[PDB]
Amino acid sequence: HHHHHSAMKIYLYHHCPYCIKVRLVADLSNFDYQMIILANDDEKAHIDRIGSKQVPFLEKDDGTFIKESDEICKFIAKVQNFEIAESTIDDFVKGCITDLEPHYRRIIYPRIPHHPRNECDFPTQSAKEYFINKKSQYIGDFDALLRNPPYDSIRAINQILAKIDPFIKTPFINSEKFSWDDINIFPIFFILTMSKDLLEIPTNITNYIKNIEAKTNIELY
């Protein structure tokens, strides 16, 4: 009835962490799906289907759609009869993950449209310029940030990851059971590898994301 992850359509971007949430559950549960990567400036492909420019969204066999990544994950888990453990990781780690946001806006986000692995998300110059024009509101100037990565944000990310690392386990983030902590935290580690040349990704986090990469079709940057 289903195949190993290596029929229903899932519309997404490669770089989007909310889409990573869906691919994580889909690949680990061997959910049979067809990955549809939408160009960043292809507004009509989003709006014609779900009426808004957002990803991810899943198309069922009956032609109806599910948006919201959390709801797509629960649907896939139901279809596959695949258990997802509840969140158990310490609130300290959740707070540290939240503190990464102002820094990865400056360190990682400007690299999104230009990274060679994101060419599927940005197959044209207009898709790249679309993203830059659309995201420069709350990010800033992409050229200035790319030429001068703020080292205070580099230090802040390194320090936060150092504080998080003792709590990170294998095979999954809370050891044996795949959980909602994997769903909510791994996408943050995933996008961090876009700037691995600038950042210090510690041992436990490195082993954890390498295991997720091995068990899925998600490739780290």
Ligand SMILES: [Cl-]
């Ligand atoms: Cl979106």
